[PDB]
Structures are given as C-alpha cells and as structure tokens.
C-alpha cells in the first residue's frame, strides 16, 4: 500500500 512510512523509510 501506500502508509507513511512508505514514504520517510522508502
């Protein structure tokens, strides 16, 4: 999916 640590972490 999409999450938020999708997104700092990758």
Do not use: T
């Not at 999916?1 to 990758?10: E, I, K, P, Q, S």
């Amino acid at each position: 999916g999409n999450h938020w640590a999708v997104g700092h972490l990758m």
